[PDB]
Design a protein around this ligand. Structure first.
Ligand code: DGD
Ligand code: CLA
Ligand code: CLA
Ligand code: CLA
Ligand code: PHO
Ligand code: PL9
Ligand code: LMG
Ligand code: SQD
Ligand code: LHG
Ligand code: BCR
Ligand code: BCR
Ligand code: STE
Ligand code: FE2
Lengths: 37, 33, 34, 30, 82, 341, 115, 38, 505, 28, 57, 65, 32
């Protein structure tokens, strides 16, 4: 049975990493006061 | 202060789980190069 | 060779006609005494 | 414990600043 | 480009344009004025006149308080003025 | 080549104002929401729903006129002109607040109409539909603030009234009752609105100060042709400027313009979600740890405790006149006041 | 104050003492900041709407643009032709220099006033 | 049984039919007279 | 490669692995259901459904099992307080186990379907290309939905072959799983009439079967197949998402206003029952009916069931909560132990006074005592210097009828102010704050948390509707507009009709 | 009542006057 | 003591604030518009009480 | 691709991909059912809203008994 | 049972941190 032809490589460049890391850390910084309450 | 104790594990995972996701995707992008 | 009444024509007067009418009404209002 | 958490996240953001400026993917032309 | 309507800057500097609108424009102004000056606007919309917000020795708002008797409540409030 | 296609042809003609199928919904609804507001603001009182003057006719100016919400006693009645409340009397309908639902409902359907217009024109011209997508943000704000919020409360009465000062009162209601500034979803909205204005200003300025010299004259506007293939400013010099000024810059013009869509749209969607919670009085009102220490410890004061005294004042001083259906009577001696004031 | 709740304190007391909501320069500030958020989204949505096909559906459209390429990466006439028909033709730009100056000027001026 | 509010509902339903039908009669007509040429 | 936000598009033309993904999702959802119930069962106190019902203890899936007939535990208790009962296998525990077994069976199937993706069934026999006949699948699935909907109404809900559903009296005092008969009249559209729920599912079931039959046999019109891109599975996503957020808005609204499907013994009072003094009216109605037949005050109030008095208390109003005040309502005001009694305030004149109740908008509220005629006669002064109406000056006393303090009267002012403070919440209850270390701040109920989540999800899914519908109608330009779109098209007056190249002037 | 004709009359004469003045060019 | 009334307001994390409620508190009303650098205070303890850091920042 | 017993049985149900009725087909009838359905949702909405008030229909918890 | 609160976070990170390390190392091996 042939191997699946729909696989595709996923990519995250370095700028997208920096952006997402920053989004998560600032989100964490904002919501933490509300989780400790 | 009398802060909620799961606040800490909430914050730690909130940070760690999506951060690790992005790190995983980035590193394996770079070793395709 | 230019139509007079068009869609554009109706859009304008749909807006312009009651604007002036309201403007006359608000004008009279400045002269109301309590 | 909450103070350690607030200051830790802040310190991580400052560290990311450093890498994002000095260790960015360099823009290259055409 | 253009869609084939007559240009505005052509219309509003034309003589025929200002022959119509020198009548239509002031007439609408005057009609709107009279709508107020005759007091018709008060009656059409139900807007209290300066003398008809309160009964004389009265200082409570005629505030509607029932959903389905609402119409009749306004009307009872009005008879307290006549 | 039936009547449908002949009408489709006439709706989709290129004219000074495109109509489309979406204009059938948009154009009556937009006109009527707008006419209702000008009609109400010019002529219609709020004496019987609110105890307020609200028209030009009554002595109000542009900042104080409003089409106001119905009385709290109408609950969430559609307040149709032909329905059981006004019973077809146009005068009583106006007096009972009916123009508020009129405007808000024809508004809602207008906003649909407009968004469908963006889809419709984008399909006909051959461009991607991201302008419609972005417009989902204004829709979320409108429905959540004007429809979802009062539906969670007792009545339309607590929706915002359509006016300048009436909206200001809505802003201050939300501070004193909901402590809406403390709400992170609003904070993300603020960051998205202000982030938008920032990006708008900084992007216009960058383009305008990295322009290529493409004409001789001192007005640099003339040296642009809408059909030139060349970029009209230097992305390269802009990237260097901002890299050395700020430490990072944009390098991808496609990302930059997506980011300009993304930021303000997102921020609006975030504040909408917070209003949805406020519909249920699910406020971000207090920090428990603070109240616990504050209660036990009369020397502990933060800007957080200071602001709740302020909200407590707002409530007690504003509530009787803002909620007249409740007949709140607060004798002088119960009103919270600091010294001397 | 230099703090998040401290900011809210300051803006609450400012309103009690100055009725800043009813001050016209603050209203222009709102119009400056609401307006700039609007035009931010507009310009970013209109440009993004008229990107020229350069990539496939398995790839980010952003790789359609290479840093420092000489040609524009969207079609401004397709953009003008969409927005001009959304409102009417002359309520839409087609000089990119005037459009970006307008982008720069609206929020700057409104924030000058609120300042 | 046939209450005042159910009569109003029918008044609203009819009013809506007339507005939508009258609007469309007028739209169909104009489109029949002023056609595009191919 | 693919951006992170598009990894799952690899399933768009892989029907087998699309099925494996849907199986994996269905496994996760049913796994959650079983895990959530086990957690609730492990933390639920069955020992007092009067003053510690499920809705005070933060139970979220219990009430949905109860609503349809699961009422008891293998441990011997039931949620109506009946004890010594034997539910057989469809206990809370058995229902949770059934979903975990289901979860695990679904997970094995997903593995099979991910591996044997290349099933001939998914291939168009004409072209050899993978393809799903979406219009016929819709008729199949609709017909199944109609059968199930019909069966659920005809058999489960009637008790013809099932338990029925939770029904109750108007004040939430005597609820139980009961077979319900269909209401075919116009009152079957009354949200509050349980029989209309039976009729709905019988009639809608038959319409589903008839319409599914129609959609298996009748092919879509060509105009419509092209308009809606009915050969593009993403159009199904766009319309499916739209139908889902429609449904999410409905269920959030019926949960907030209340319908026959959200009884208050499973979810709690609504805020409107506080707004309109709904329980208070009935409680007063019952005390007047006692006093009428000459029952002493003590006796008339003692006849009030504590369960009805507990509804007349703002602490169970789902609109007194906060976004980050977590946990059960019990974590806030404590675990209710007893109704202390109904409190009657009088001044030195013997006039009876009334505490003005707190409305749901206010986190704090003044203490203002009024007479029958609404005239303010006592309060707790903020500024003491010009106080006229203080409890001390006005000689205010509190007397209790019913409950734990029946027949007791307090006169010393700091005590009378103390109960006067709690009286703005309505009826006065004894709470246990030590057990859960309660902090004293009201929380919302499962009625509130459900409405909030579903109102929010609905709104978000509306954007998914917009995104995925835009993607269907504009598939051809997803990657960008045509690089050879010529300016004669987008400029004005070249064509008579916009975008129609055949209408050139 | 009477104020309705008063208000309506300027606008009837206004639409009268424009109709007369434009009637030839409208028939074309 | 932001308002000069010997009523100090806690602004910092170690003193029971979170990220939302914390602030550097403005300098004392007792100072008004006066210039309050560190070297004008008799000690850093005094300078901290009266809000010196805000003026410096 | 792989053939299976169950697949061979279900085969005819996934075999008319692409097929359409001509022109507008049943579209007029669909339109009628839509319109009926809207009126119907209207009546349901306005009943719940107490804008439509029918005899013997007490839109309150007191209809539960 | 009166257990240690930090025990949960100590256990969770004890699992999470080293596991994630191995996952990062494995996935980039495969994509090269
Ligand atoms: C993005 C896309 C945008 C596109 C939108 C386009 C515009 C669409 C127009 C929407 C029409 C909305 C009408 C809402 C009317 C409403 O609800 O009106 C309210 C009525 C319920 O009536 C209310 O009921 C309340 C509870 O009553 C009950 O309680 C009382 C005391 O206990 C008595 O028992 C009384 O008899 C009993 O009925 C109070 O009485 C209120 O005063 C009364 O208005 O519901 C009903 O009409 C129907 C309610 C069930 C249907 C759910 C509506 C769906 C939307 C709701 C989501 C809101 C969010 C929910 C979270 C908050
Ligand atoms: C397409 C444009 C449009 C849309 C979407 C709306 C939408 C609305 N209008 Mg608005 N309106 C419009 C145009 C529109 N209006 C126009 C042109 C006018 C000027 C006359 C008005 C004037 C107006 C007023 C004055 C009021 C509304 C109101 C309303 C609301 C309730 C409508 C309702 O109950 O419909 C019910 C009816 C329908 C939906 C039509 C049903 C059509 C079906 C398919 C045909 C059925 C056939 C027929 C019944 C059979 C007859 C049989 C015969 C042989 C006897 C809603 C927001 C009310 C409102 O805002 O309340 C506050 C209100 O009082 N409208
Ligand atoms: C529809 C979903 C739903 C609903 C309505 C509830 C409702 C409830 N649950 Mg359940 N629960 C759910 C799902 C749900 N649960 C799921 C999926 C799990 C597994 C994680 C659980 C596990 C669970 C446990 C273990 C417990 C409950 C409990 C409770 C009760 C208290 C809830 C509370 O305090 O929330 C608090 C709500 C919040 C703090 C809001 C969180 C949302 C934050 C603010 C947003 C996150 C930030 C986000 C990234 C924003 C940025 C986005 C932007 C970038 C785009 C309540 C009845 C408790 C109870 O009383 O048990 C008896 C309890 O102990 N639940
Ligand atoms: C059943 C509903 C459904 C389904 C099957 C899909 C499926 C899809 N979407 Mg749509 N979408 C939906 C609802 C749905 N969407 C909703 C409600 C919205 C509005 C939020 C969107 C908005 C949306 C956008 C904006 C985009 C898609 C895209 C896509 C495609 C790629 C998704 C992907 O790789 O995600 C990858 C996701 C991840 C790798 C992780 C994301 C984690 C999120 C942020 C939070 C954590 C989720 C949590 C674990 C589980 C949710 C719990 C709760 C929902 C119950 C795929 C066909 C993309 C597309 O079209 O590509 C062509 C795209 O750009 N979707
Ligand atoms: C107060 C703030 C504010 C206003 C007034 C506003 C206004 C507008 N935005 C539009 C567009 C947009 N808005 C966008 C993003 C944003 N818009 C924002 C904020 C605003 N946007 C923000 C913050 C953003 C950032 C995300 C985008 C991306 C678009 C567009 O594409 C579009 C456009 O063309 O921009 C140029 C236009 C759509 C007009 C329309 O639907 O016509 C039809 C008119 C209808 C249907 C009537 C609506 C009736 C309303 C809803 C209720 C009644 C209102 C009364 C008439 C007035 C009462 C007012 C009192 C309160 C004072 C319009 C000029
Ligand atoms: C009793 C009875 C029967 C009563 C009678 C009632 C009756 C029957 C009524 C029915 C009437 C009828 C059917 C209706 C038709 C009438 C009709 C005309 C109705 C009125 C419609 C109406 C209300 C419209 C609303 C008005 C409207 C919102 C206009 C606002 C225009 C305006 C100010 C918009 C902003 C313009 C602007 C400068 C935006 C800049 C944005 C920005 C900087 C974009 C960035 C940008 C721009 C570009 O340009 C390009 C290029 C690029 C790259 C780019 O970045
Ligand atoms: C991978 C998943 C893990 C990674 C995510 C990182 C953790 C995320 C943390 C989010 C939760 C943060 C809340 C912390 C609460 C906590 O500490 O207390 C823990 C509380 C439980 O409450 C506990 O209850 C106890 C008795 O049972 C006592 O009362 C304790 O004091 C009390 O803390 O957590 C919750 O109740 C969990 C339920 C969450 C489900 C809410 C669903 C409804 C909201 C949906 C809204 C959607 C929003 C969309 C936004 C767009
Ligand atoms: C009692 C009487 C009172 C009288 C008062 C009179 C009022 C007017 C005074 C103001 C005059 C200002 C001049 C504007 C012209 C100019 O700017 O040209 C520059 C450009 C380009 O014109 C461009 O013109 C170019 C030709 S050329 O440069 O002009 O030669 C051409 O190339 C290009 O395509 C075209 O767009 O103009 C525009 O693109 C419009 C931008 C609007 C500028 C003001 C911004 C508004 C800010 C307010 C925000 C506050 C809200 C918060
Ligand atoms: C702040 C905006 C400033 C932008 C200025 C222009 C941007 C650049 C324009 C591109 C080409 C340059 C031409 C510049 C010059 C230019 O701007 O000319 C303005 C334009 C001139 O049109 P004419 O054809 O009259 O002009 C003749 C010219 O050739 C003279 O040179 O006037 C109008 O469009 C009038 C519109 C009023 C319409 C009345 C209301 C109609 C109701 C419609 C309802 C709204 C639609 C509803 C949708 C929901
Ligand atoms: C409601 C209703 C309706 C409708 C109506 C309408 C539709 C209306 C309209 C109306 C209108 C349509 C109006 C208008 C008006 C206007 C006005 C009143 C305006 C004014 C303006 C001005 C004032 C301006 C000026 C200025 C300034 C000030 C500054 C700057 C410059 C300028 C010039 C801008 C109907 C019948 C259906 C029925 C039901 C009810
Ligand atoms: C294999 C098998 C088995 C077993 C099974 C199992 C054991 C299962 C499990 C399963 C389960 C046990 C599952 C569970 C699941 C879970 C989940 C699925 C969850 C969810 C979550 C979420 C999603 C969340 C989210 C969130 C958060 C976190 C925060 C807040 C917000 C939200 C809500 C969003 C059996 C024996 C049967 C048989 C054979 C085979
Ligand atoms: C989607 C189509 C909706 C448009 C319908 C608009 C209806 C037009 C309003 C007509 C109302 C006229 C009658 C008002 C009440 C008459 C008095 C009565 O009830 O007998
Ligand atoms: Fe740009």
């Amino acid at each position: 049975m042939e191997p699946n032809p729909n696989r595709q490589p996923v990519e995250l460049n370095r700028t997208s990493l920096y952006l997402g890391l920053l989004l998560i850390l600032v989100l964490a910084l904002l919501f933490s006061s509300y989780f400790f309450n | 202060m009398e802060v909620n104790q799961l606040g800490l594990i909430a914050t730690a995972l909130f940070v760690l789980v999506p951060s690790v996701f992005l790190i995983i995707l980035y590193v394996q992008t770079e070793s395709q190069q | 060779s230019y139509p007079i009444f068009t869609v554009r024509w109706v859009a304008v007067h749909t807006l312009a006609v009651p604007t002036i009418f309201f403007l006359g009404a608000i004008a009279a209002m400045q002269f109301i005494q309590r | 414990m909450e103070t350690i958490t607030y200051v830790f996240i802040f310190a991580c953001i400052i560290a990311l600043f450093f890498f994002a400026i000095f260790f960015r993917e360099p823009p290259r032309i055409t | 480009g253009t869609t084939g309507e007559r240009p505005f800057s052509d219309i509003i500097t034309s003589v025929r344009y200002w022959v119509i609108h020198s009548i239509t424009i002031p007439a609408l102004f005057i009609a709107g004025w009279l709508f107020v000056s005759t007091g018709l606007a008060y009656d059409v919309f139900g807007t209290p006149r300066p003398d008809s917000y309160y009964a004389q020795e009265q200082r409570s708002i005629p505030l509607v308080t029932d959903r389905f008797e609402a119409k009749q409540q306004v009307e009872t409030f009005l008879e307290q003025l006549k | 080549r039936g009547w449908f296609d002949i009408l489709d042809d006439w709706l989709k003609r290129d004219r000074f104002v495109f109509v489309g199928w979406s204009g059938i919904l948009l154009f009556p609804c937009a006109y009527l929401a707008l006419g209702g507001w000008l009609t109400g603001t010019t002529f219609v009182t709020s004496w019987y729903t609110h105890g307020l003057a609200s028209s030009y006719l009554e002595g109000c100016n542009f900042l104080t006129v409003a089409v106001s919400t119905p009385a709290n006693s109408m609950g969430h009645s559609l307040l149709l002109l032909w329905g059981p409340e006004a019973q077809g009397d146009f005068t009583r309908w106006c007096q009972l607040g009916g123009l508020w639902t009129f405007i808000a409902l024809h508004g809602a359907f207008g906003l649909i109409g407009f968004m469908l217009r963006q889809f419709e024109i984008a399909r006909l011209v051959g461009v991607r539909p991201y302008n419609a997508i972005a417009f989902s943000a204004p829709i979320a704000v409108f429905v959540s603030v004007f429809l979802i919020y009062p539906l969670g409360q007792s009545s339309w009465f607590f929706a915002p009234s359509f006016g300048v000062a009436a909206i200001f009162r809505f802003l201050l209601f939300f501070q004193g009752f909901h402590n809406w500034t403390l709400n992170p979803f609003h904070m993300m909205g603020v960051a998205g609105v202000l982030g938008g204005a920032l990006l708008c200003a900084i992007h216009g300025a960058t383009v305008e100060n990295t322009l290529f010299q493409d004409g001789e004259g001192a007005s640099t506007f003339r040296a642009f042709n809408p059909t030139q293939a060349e970029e009209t400013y230097s992305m390269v010099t802009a990237n260097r400027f901002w890299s050395q000024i700020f430490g990072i810059a944009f390098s991808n013009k496609r990302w930059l313009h997506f980011f300009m869509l993304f930021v303000p749209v997102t921020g609006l969607w975030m504040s909408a979600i917070g209003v949805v919670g406020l519909a249920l009085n699910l406020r971000s009102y207090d920090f428990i740890s603070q109240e616990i220490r504050a209660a036990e410890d009369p020397e502990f004061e933060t800007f957080y405790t200071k602001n709740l005294l302020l909200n407590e004042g707002i409530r007690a001083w504003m509530a009787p006149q803002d909620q007249p259906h409740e007949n709140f009577v607060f004798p002088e001696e119960v009103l919270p006041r600091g010294n001397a004031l | 104050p230099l703090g998040i709740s401290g900011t809210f304190n300051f803006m609450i007391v400012f309103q009690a003492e100055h009725n800043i909501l009813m001050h016209p320069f603050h209203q222009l500030g709102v119009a400056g900041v609401f307006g700039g958020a609007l035009f931010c989204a507009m310009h970013g949505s209109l440009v993004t709407s008229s990107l020229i096909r350069e990539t496939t559906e398995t790839e980010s459209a952003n790789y359609g643009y290479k840093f420092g390429q000489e040609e524009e990466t969207y079609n401004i006439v397709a953009a003008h032709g969409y927005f001009g028909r959304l409102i009417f033709q002359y309520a839409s730009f087609n000089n990119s220099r005037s459009l970006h100056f307008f982008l720069a000027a609206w929020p700057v001026v409104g924030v000058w006033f609120t300042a | 049984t046939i209450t005042p509010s159910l009569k109003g509902f029918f008044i609203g339903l009819l009013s809506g039919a007339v507005v939508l039908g009258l609007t469309f009669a007028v739209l169909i007509a104009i489109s029949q007279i002023d056609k595009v040429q191919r | 490669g693919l951006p992170w936000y598009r990894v799952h598009t690899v399933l768009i033309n892989d029907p087998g692995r699309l099925i494996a993904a849907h199986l994996m999702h269905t496994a996760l959802v049913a796994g959650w259901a079983g895990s959530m119930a086990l957690y609730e069962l492990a933390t639920f106190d069955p020992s007092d459904p009067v003053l510690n019902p499920m809705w005070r203890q933060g139970m979220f899936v219990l009430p949905f099992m109860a609503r349809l007939g699961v009422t008891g535990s293998w441990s011997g208790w039931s949620i109506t307080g009946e004890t010594g009962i034997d539910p057989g296998f469809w206990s809370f525990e058995g229902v949770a186990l059934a979903h975990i077994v289901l979860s695990g069976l679904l997970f094995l199937a997903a593995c099979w379907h991910w591996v044997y993706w290349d099933l001939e069934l998914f291939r168009d026999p004409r072209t050899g290309e993978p393809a799903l006949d979406l219009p016929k699948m819709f008729g199949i699935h609709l017909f199944l939905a109609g059968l199930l909907c019909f069966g659920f109404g005809a058999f489960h809900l009637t008790g013809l072959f099932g338990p029925g559903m939770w029904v109750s009296d108007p004040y939430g005092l005597t609820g139980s799983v009961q077979p319900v008969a269909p209401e075919w009249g116009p009152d079957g559209f009354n949200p509050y009439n349980p029989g209309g729920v039976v009729a709905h599912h019988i009639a809608a079931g038959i319409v589903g079967i008839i319409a599914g039959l129609f959609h298996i046999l009748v092919r879509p019109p060509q105009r419509l197949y092209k308009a809606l891109r009915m050969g593009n599975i993403e159009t199904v996503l766009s319309s499916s998402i739209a139908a889902v957020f429609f449904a999410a808005f409905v269920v959030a609204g019926t949960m907030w206003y209340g319908s026959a499907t959200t009884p208050i013994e499973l979810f709690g009072p609504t805020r409107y029952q506080w707004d309109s003094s709904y329980f208070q009216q009935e409680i007063n109605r019952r005390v007047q009916a006692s006093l009428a037949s000459g029952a002493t005050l003590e006796e008339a109030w003692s006849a009030i069931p504590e369960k009805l008095a507990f509804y007349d208390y703002i602490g169970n109003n789902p609109a007194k909560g906060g976004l980050f005040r977590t946990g059960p309502m019990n974590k806030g005001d404590g675990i209710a132990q007893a109704w202390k009694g109904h409190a009657v305030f009088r001044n030195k004149e013997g006039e009876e006074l009334f505490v003005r109740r707190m409305p749901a908008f206010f986190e704090s509220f003044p203490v203002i005592l009024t007479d029958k005629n609404g005239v303010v006669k006592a309060d707790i002064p903020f500024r003491r210097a010009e106080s006229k109406y203080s409890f001390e000056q006005q000689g205010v006393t509190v007397s209790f009828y019913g409950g734990e303090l029946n027949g007791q009267t307090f006169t010393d002012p700091p005590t009378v102010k103390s109960y006067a403070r709690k009286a703005i919440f309505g009826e006065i209850f004894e709470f246990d704050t030590e057990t859960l270390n309660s902090d004293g701040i009201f929380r919302t109920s499962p009625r509130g948390w459900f409405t909030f989540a579903h109102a929010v999800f609905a709104l978000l899914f509306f954007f998914g509707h917009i995104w995925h519908g835009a993607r269907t109608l504009f598939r051809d330009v997803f990657s960008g507009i045509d690089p050879e779109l010529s300016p004669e098209q987008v400029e004005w007056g070249f064509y008579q009709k916009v975008g129609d190249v055949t209408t050139r002037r | 009542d009477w104020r309705v004709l008063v208000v309506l009359l300027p606008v009837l004469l206004a639409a009268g006057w424009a109709v007369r003045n434009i009637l030839p060019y409208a028939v074309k | 003591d932001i308002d000069g009334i010997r009523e100090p307001v806690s602004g910092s994390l170690l003193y029971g604030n979170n990220i939302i409620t914390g602030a550097v508190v403005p300098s004392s009303n007792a100072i008004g518009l006066h210039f309050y650098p560190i070297w004008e205070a008799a000690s850093l303890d005094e300078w901290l009480y009266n809000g010196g850091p805000y003026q410096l920042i | 691709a792989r053939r299976t017993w169950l697949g061979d049985i279900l085969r005819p149900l996934n075999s008319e991909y692409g097929k359409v009725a001509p022109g507008w087909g049943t579209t007029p009838l669909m339109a009628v059912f839509m319109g009926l359905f809207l009126v119907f949702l209207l009546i349901i909405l306005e009943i719940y809203n107490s804008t439509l008030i029918l005899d013997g229909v007490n839109v309150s918890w007191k209809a539960l008994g």
